[PDB]
Design a binder for this molecule. Structure first.
Ligand SMILES: *[C@@H]1O[C@H](CO)[C@@H](O[C@@H]2O[C@H](CO)[C@@H](O[C@@H]3O[C@H](CO)[C@@H](O[C@@H]4O[C@H](CO)[C@@H](O)[C@H](O)[C@H]4NC(C)=O)[C@H](O)[C@H]3NC(C)=O)[C@H](O)[C@H]2NC(C)=O)[C@H](O)[C@H]1NC(C)=O
Ligand SMILES: *[P@@](=O)(CCC)O[C@H](CNC(=O)OC)c1ccccc1
Length: 317
C-alpha cells in the first residue's frame, strides 16, 4: 500500500471546490456530513436525488456530493482529485471528525483509488458503503471500446485496463477502511458478479461483500441501479452507516428485507425518479466524449502497471 505524501493534484484547488456541494451548507461548516460519489454518466444529484440525499438526511446526515465533469466520463484519476479534495475539506468543516463515504458504480472505484494512492484521507474516512462498485471494471465495456465510443473512464473501467491493474498491484483490492460492497449477480452493466467470491468485480478482501442473491435467493433481481435504490439496499446501507464497526452487519438484515422495489421511506415521486435513475446516465455516455485508447496513468500509479498500454504506449516505471 503506497504511503507518504499525497500525489499533487493536476487540477486547480478552486476548480475542485466547484465540483463540491452540500445540501443547505458550506463544506467548511457542515454538521455530520456524508460524501456521495456518483456513478458513470451522472452528476451527484442525478445519482442521488431520488435516493440517498433524502435517505441520509432522514438518518441525521448532511449530504454532500461531487459532480466531476462531464458526468464522471473524464479520467477516473481526475474524478478522484475531486473526492480527495472534498474529504479534505469536509473533515475540516465538520470539526476534524471522520465522515462516511457512500458511492455508486465508478463511485466505488474512485473512493478506493483515492484511499489507495492518497494516504492522508485514510484517517478522515469513517467507513465506505459502495453500491455496485467495479474495482475490477466490467467485461461488458468491450464492445464500446472496440467501437471507439468509450469515454476516458469507460476505458479505465474495462476489465484488464491499466487502471484496474494499477489499483490491484498497489494493494487496492483489500479493504482499507471498513467497507461494505452491495452488488447484484444480475447486473447488466458490471460483470463478472455471479460467483459470490473474490472473482466478483465488487469484492474486496476483508470487506463486507454482499451479493444480494446470496441473501435473497437466485430469483432476487435488482439491476445496476436497483443495487443503489431498493428497499433491500437501504436496509443494508442503514446497517453500514449506523454500525459501530463501520461495516454492515448480518444481524441487521435478512429475508424479510428482500424487497427489490424502491426504498419504502421515499416519497412516491422519489420512488418514480428512483426507477428512472439509469436514463440520464445512458444518455450522457451516448453523446459524451469518445476515444480509441485508455488514458495514461499519472506518475504515482505507473510503477504498479508496467507492461500495460495507455494512449502514450507501454507503461514503464
Ligand atoms: C479531464 O482529464 C484530462 C486528463 O487528465 C485533464 O487533462 C489534464 O489537465 C491538466 C490540467 O488541466 C494538465 O496538466 C497540468 O495542469 C496543471 C494544473 O494547475 C498545470 O500546473 C499549473 O501551471 C500553471 C501555469 O504554469 C501554474 O500557474 C499553476 O501553479 C499550476 N497549477 C497547479 C494547481 O499546480 C501544469 O502546467 C500541467 N502539467 C503538464 C505536464 O502539462 C494536463 O496536462 C492535462 N493532461 C492531458 C493529457 O491533457 C483535463 O483537465 C480533465 N478535464 C476536466 C474538465 O476535468
Ligand atoms: P457505473 O458508473 C459502471 C460503469 C461501467 O454505471 C453506468 C450507470 N448505468 C445505468 O444507469 O444504467 C444504464 C453505465 C455503464 C455502462 C453503460 C451505461 C451506464
Amino acid at each position: 500500500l503506497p504511503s507518504g505524501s499525497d500525489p499533487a493534484f493536476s487540477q486547480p484547488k478552486s476548480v475542485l471546490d466547484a465540483g463540491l456541494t452540500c445540501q443547505g451548507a458550506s463544506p467548511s461548516s457542515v454538521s455530520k456530513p456524508i460524501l456521495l460519489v456518483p456513478g458513470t454518466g451522472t452528476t451527484g444529484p442525478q445519482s442521488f436525488d431520488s435516493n440517498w440525499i433524502p435517505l441520509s438526511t432522514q438518518l441525521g446526515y448532511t449530504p454532500c456530493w461531487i459532480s466531476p465533469p462531464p458526468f464522471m466520463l473524464n479520467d477516473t484519476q481526475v474524478n478522484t482529485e475531486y473526492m480527495v479534495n472534498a474529504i479534505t475539506a469536509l473533515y475540516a468543516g465538520s470539526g476534524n471528525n471522520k465522515l462516511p463515504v457512500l458511492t455508486w458504480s465508478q463511485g466505488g472505484l474512485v473512493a478506493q483509488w483515492g484511499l489507495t494512492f492518497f494516504p492522508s484521507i485514510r484517517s478522515k474516512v469513517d467507513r465506505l458503503m459502495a453500491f455496485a462498485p467495479d474495482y475490477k471494471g466490467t467485461v461488458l465495456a468491450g464492445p464500446l471500446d472496440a467501437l471507439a465510443v468509450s469515454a476516458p473512464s469507460v476505458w479505465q473501467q474495462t476489465t484488464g485496463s491499466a487502471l484496474t491493474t494499477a489499483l490491484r498491484n498497489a494493494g487496492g483490492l483489500t479493504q482499507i477502511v471498513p467497507t461494505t460492497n452491495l452488488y447484484s449477480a444480475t447486473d447488466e452493466i458490471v460483470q463478472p458478479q455471479v460467483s459470490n467470491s473474490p472473482l466478483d468485480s465488487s469484492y474486496l478482501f476483508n470487506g463486507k461483500n454482499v451479493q444480494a442473491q446470496a441473501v435473497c435467493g437466485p430469483l432476487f433481481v435488482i439491476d445496476h441501479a436497483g443495487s443503489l435504490t431498493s428497499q433491500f439496499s437501504y436496509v443494508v446501507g442503514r446497517s453500514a452507516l449506523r454500525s459501530t464497526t463501520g461495516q454492515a452487519r448480518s444481524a441487521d438484515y435478512g429475508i424479510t428485507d428482500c424487497n427489490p422495489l424502491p426504498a419504502n421511506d421515499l416519497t412516491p415521486e422519489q420512488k418514480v425518479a428512483a426507477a428512472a435513475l439509469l436514463a440520464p446516465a445512458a444518455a450522457a455516455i451516448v453523446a459524451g466524449p469518445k476515444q480509441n485508447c485508455e488514458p495514461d496513468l499519472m506518475p504515482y500509479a505507473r510503477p504498479f502497471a508496467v507492461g500495460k498500454r495507455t494512449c502514450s504506449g507501454i507503461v514503464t516505471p
